[model samples]
Target: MDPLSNFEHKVITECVTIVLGDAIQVAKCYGESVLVNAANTHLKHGGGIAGAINAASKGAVQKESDEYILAKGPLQVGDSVLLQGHSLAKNILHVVGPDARAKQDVSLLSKCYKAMNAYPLVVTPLVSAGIFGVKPAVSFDYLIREAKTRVLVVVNSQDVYKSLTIV
Candidate 1:
């Protein structure tokens, strides 16, 4: 599955490119319009792509995210929070994917992807596929179909990339 051709399945006009690199670094090149991916509802700077963004911003990303959570209360599975004052990108859209391995709710992941609606361009890692245990293809497949804006699906390893059959 060639990612170039995999993107050909798009029903909408928006584009999704399967990019292999650091999500934050690539996002920095795009400036403020990019959305950085986060897999946690708590929005903590634990690990993954959001961690790097949080680390790069001197924990400003987490600080702002905490402020948002305080104002908004708990985030549901599909809920997302957008923040600024982060060096990774001017805008940070933190959308939480369900832990598919726990509850095994597929719809929750759908809600997760749909909730990521803030930016025209987003740099997302494989949502719900890491500790959450959803298949990479399943997550990426849903993401590409539901995206309303241009998306950059970032993969850090060749193994993950190989699981996707974009064509």
Candidate 2:
């Protein structure tokens, strides 16, 4: 079978194309596409929309706001919230795949896959395991191959503009 066949029925080709680039440029493109700063979240961080959701999930590291609370708990599960009045997309789906936690369960990919099946426009960041002494390439490669969306990597070169470019 084709490696990507499973994604064929799950993928959607909206006039709204989901972009996968460095966070900043993707954010700008989102703004232009949806006509709102909601897309700005993509640019505010350094990866892609998924990175922004991860940042937002962690409460922005700046200040706690109703916004995070809006997405907190089960409601945060695969449900999209509007930012600055535009619906950037639905839900910031969170998945805890293979890791070294006491509750480490990579098998949860089935659950994540189910969530993605539910939300057609879902986005996810490459989980940060290898960066902290884990296998980075393995973690990165697994996520890249699994996620249906064009996966976006957060490049951290000195050139901030170049930082957002796709690999």
Candidate 3:
């Protein structure tokens, strides 16, 4: 069976799971689509996937994220805000995930994916699997479940990329 066989609409020949290398490489390979930023309630790109994306986009990600937070207050778990991606991507979907130090809420992450279903091609990092502390398997599970279109999951480490592909 093909890995991409399940999706209703697929733009690529295969559903590729890449071990994240250069940020620029990934962006060029995937094209200027929607990039998912695993953010906090404050929408600040301080650490984890958010920080990496913000840095790659030359702080444009942080600037837009901060502006949205200031206008709308803190985002609830599973809630999302869309922003211009600057040099990183065509659009950025900033979603607040469950905090690692706090009680874990699996459903919140699922909602995050659901909120961004309108995009045809989406690029997402391992949500809550790094600094935020959600289990790797759990994060991948929810991502697959809620994906309504083609999704490219970005992982900084080979181990995470392997784990997600096995699922």
Candidate 4:
């Protein structure tokens, strides 16, 4: 069966869209700030979540990501940087989340969500849910509870969708 495109829910001052596809393709539908689940070491296009995002921007994303590391060094867990979105979205918020295996710190997860508030709308994926660990349910709860603006979270699996979706 075709995957569900997305679903939405709203809070008093926040909105969330859970997407089952790629954030790059859904960038226009959401808003300017497309949050990239970045590596704690650096923000290079590398592979995984960032690879797809950089492809959409035709290496422009990679360039800025590289520059960020050059200027600021490695990103600490929960650290984030906002970069000019060349093509995909208006701005790209690169955030490094805490690792679940080592430190599933929801506090860092909360920081990731808070950094994105710099923009009113954010298209994000499950940060730290990849190699960093952090379960989708935890990520979802923190995202929805902490968000102060419209946010879109891209999920790639059916199990994860079912696990985190309250809507």
Clash count, one per candidate: 1, 5, 0, 0
Encode model 2's per-residue lDDT on 1-167: one tens digit a residue.
33223221122232122223333333332322211111111122334333454464463421322444445532221133333312332323333333344344444433333333343333333343322222434444444445554432333232422322234
**Candidate 1, 1-167: lDDT as tens digits:** 33334222222234776766667766666665556566577777686666777888888877887887788876777667666736676677777888765685766767767766556667677787777777788888788778777777777776677556334
Weakest ten-residue segment in model 3 by summed lDDT: 4-13
How well is each residue in 1-97 modelled by candidate 3, as lDDT tens digits? Answer: 4433333222322442434443334544555568888888888788777777788888877777777778888888878888887767778888788
Off by over 4 Å in 2: 1-28, 31-90, 120-122, 128-134, 153-167
Every model's Cα RMSD, please? 4.7, 10.4, 5.2, 4.1
Task: Give per-residue CA lDDT, model 4, range 1-167, as digits (tens).
Answer: 21223433223233776776676766755444565555565775666788877777788877877787898788887888878877677777888888777865757888888887777778788887777777778777788878777777778777777666545
lDDT of 3 at 1: 40
Model 3 scores a C-alpha lDDT of 0.70
Candidate 4 collision pairs: none
Q: Candidate 1: lDDT over CA atoms?
A: 0.69
- Alpha carbon RMSD to native, model 3: 5.2
> What TM-score does model 2 achieve against the real structure?
0.37
Model 1, runs deviating above 4 Å: 1-14, 165-167
Number of colliding residue pairs in model 2: 5
- Model 4: lowest-lDDT 10 consecutive positions: 1-10
In terms of lDDT, which candidate is strongest?
Answer: 4
